[PDB]
Design a binder for this molecule. Structure first.
Ligand SMILES: CCCCCCCCCCCCO[C@H]1O[C@H](CO)[C@@H](O[C@H]2O[C@H](CO)[C@@H](O)[C@H](O)[C@H]2O)[C@H](O)[C@H]1O
Ligand SMILES: CCCCCCCCCO[C@@H]1O[C@H](CO)[C@@H](O)[C@H](O)[C@H]1O
Ligand SMILES: CCCCCCCCCO[C@@H]1O[C@H](CO)[C@@H](O)[C@H](O)[C@H]1O
Ligand SMILES: CCCCCCCCCO[C@@H]1O[C@H](CO)[C@@H](O)[C@H](O)[C@H]1O
Ligand SMILES: CCCCCCCCCO[C@@H]1O[C@H](CO)[C@@H](O)[C@H](O)[C@H]1O
Ligand SMILES: N[C@@H](Cc1c[nH]c2ccccc12)C(=O)O
Ligand code: NA
Ligand code: NA
Length: 441
């Protein structure tokens, strides 16, 4: 009685919907900014090609072969073997990541509400930066918008794969991309393009002699690809033998990278035209974008379109995050989909609440030494659980599978590409991750 994608394009568009969201605009911007731009970018692009694409194909393959959740897939394919630690850790990463993802997405709804009610058309007296700061440090206001976003997320997951997840509006992601392209072109004309483009594309290798940069690059590569937690195993598990995995993996990574690159071309020349520091941290785009819209005559209209379209993208990504614990709990405890979605969704919302508060009244609390609550949850989930899970997933196919199976189940043959793929999983990817972990600690 397991669900399957009803439509032929269902799978690839769902995988794409999962990947493209806040990580491409909000996260990519502030992480690229605080790590120095171009050298970080190049390391990130390297990781996408050589680690991301293979491990994406790996998740797809595992999931389609087992037709089960992130944990169940490992149990089914290799019962009594330790590999399932990856999926157990992924379920946990799912709780953690969605708990703060819903907070940032709630910031998005707040901004959308303000544009719609005419509030952010001109600069507030305290300025766009002052407006943002006052919002997020408010103890309760961000929580209301967060709860609102999670309700929407819970509802789609409760509805089902076919009736909910698959039924996204197909025009919204391509509209977001076009708007991003148009906005990138516009910020190129604002006066900071020479400096913003040099920050973004002209490497300074001095930054690379910090091992923190490599780990930030790999974390962002996993995060943006919806990777390492079994989210793509899960989506893959709803897929029939009528699907071509390698093409999907490449398309997902290519398109996700296009979005991030254009987002960067929008943001950094804008950062530089405004005189701001690119190291501004998580609120970077919430401070920059409204400034950019304000300089356009029809800018309030652009603002409405942007926050709507990014909101829809954050929504499809959030749904894929919630789908991981939901799928697992449905199987493991015979919970109904609606019951799992509501229960886990509320729990994850509440878990999210101290991360929201860390931007204000809890700003001085640490968990991991020196890191506030938000930064700690993100570090653990994105920089520890995701790359480790990815490593185990890579080793699993690479060393725990017969090669003929690995290739057949992934729609590859023992050609140059199949060989390249297998080499990635056995050695390149898991060793690069190992070396990043060892060096960064
Ligand atoms: C986006 C899709 C639509 C969703 C459904 C709409 C339902 C309507 C709910 C809106 C009610 C929220 O009300 C809220 O609005 C104002 C801001 O926007 C707040 O005003 C606030 O603005 C600042 C943020 O920078 C705060 O730090 C201030 O303490 C406060 O003055 C009100 O203190 C609050 O009560
Ligand atoms: C689908 C693609 C959409 C493309 C949109 C690009 C529009 C760029 C607008 O630039 C602005 O136009 C003024 C007049 O040309 C200049 O004086 C001003 O200094 C400049 O900032
Ligand atoms: C959509 C546009 C994409 C093009 C991006 C390429 C920009 C990266 C290089 O920057 C260049 O670095 C040199 C020294 O730092 C400067 O002499 C030069 O003036 C500057 O432009
Ligand atoms: C839309 C895609 C844009 C990506 C462009 C990537 C290449 C830009 C980097 O070139 C820069 O030029 C400098 C000038 O001397 C040199 O220092 C060095 O070669 C490099 O720092
Ligand atoms: C799909 C559409 C995307 C829209 C993004 C591009 C904005 C068009 C620019 O217009 C003009 O830019 C000047 C900038 O200084 C202003 O003088 C002027 O008042 C403003 O109207
Ligand atoms: N990839 C999405 C977020 C996301 C959805 N599902 C995931 C699973 C794991 C890690 C990240 C995600 C983004 O860039 O916004
Ligand atoms: Na992404
Ligand atoms: Na999305």
């Amino acid at each position: 009685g397991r669900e399957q994608w009803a439509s032929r394009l269902g799978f690839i568009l769902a995988a794409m919907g999962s990947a493209v969201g806040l990580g491409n605009i909000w996260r990519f911007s502030y992480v690229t900014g605080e790590n120095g731009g171009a050298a970080f970018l190049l390391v990130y692009l390297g990781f996408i090609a050589l680690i991301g694409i293979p491990i994406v194909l790996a998740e797809f393959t595992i999931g389609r072969r087992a037709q089960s959740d992130a944990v169940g897939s490992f149990e089914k394919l290799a019962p009594g073997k330790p590999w399932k630690v990856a999926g157990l850790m992924g379920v946990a990463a799912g709780f953690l990541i969605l708990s703060f993802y819903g907070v940032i997405a709630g910031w998005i709804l707040f901004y959308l509400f303000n544009y719609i009610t005419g509030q952010l058309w001109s600069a507030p007296a305290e300025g766009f930066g002052g407006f943002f700061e006052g919002f997020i440090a408010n103890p309760t206001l961000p929580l209301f918008w967060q709860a609102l976003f999670m309700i929407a997320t819970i509802w789609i997951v409760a509805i089902g794969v076919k009736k909910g997840i698959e039924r996204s509006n197909k025009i919204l992601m391509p509209l977001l991309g076009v708007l991003l392209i148009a906005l990138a072109i516009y910020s190129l004309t604002l006066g900071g393009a020479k400096e913003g483009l040099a920050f973004l594309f002209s490497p300074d290798w001095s930054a690379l002699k910090d091992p923190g940069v490599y780990l930030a690059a790999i974390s962002q590569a996993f995060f943006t690809l919806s990777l390492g937690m079994g989210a793509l195993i899960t989506y893959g598990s709803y897929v029939s033998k009528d699907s071509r995995l390698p093409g999907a993996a490449v398309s997902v990574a290519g398109l996700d990278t296009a979005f991030a690159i254009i987002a960067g071309i929008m943001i950094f020349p804008a950062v530089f035209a405004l005189g701001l520091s690119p190291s501004g941290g998580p609120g970077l785009v919430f401070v920059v974008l409204p400034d950019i819209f304000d300089s356009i005559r029809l800018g309030p209209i652009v603002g409405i379109a942007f926050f709507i379209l990014l909101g829809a993208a954050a929504l499809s990504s959030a749904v894929s995050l919630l789908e991981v614990p939901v799928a697992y709990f449905m199987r493991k405890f015979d919970w109904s989909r609606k019951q799992a979605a509501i229960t886990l969704g509320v729990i994850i919302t509440l878990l999210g609440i101290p991360s929201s508060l860390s931007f204000g009244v809890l700003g001085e609390v640490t968990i991991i030494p020196g890191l506030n609550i938000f930064d700690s949850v993100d570090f653990i989930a994105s920089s520890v659980f995701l790359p480790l899970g990815g490593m185990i997933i890579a080793l699993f196919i690479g060393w725990g599978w017969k090669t003929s199976d690995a290739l057949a189940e992934s729609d590859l043959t023992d050609s140059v590409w199949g060989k390249l793929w297998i080499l990635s999983l056995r050695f390149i990817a898991p060793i690069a991750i190992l070396i990043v972990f060892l060096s960064a600690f």
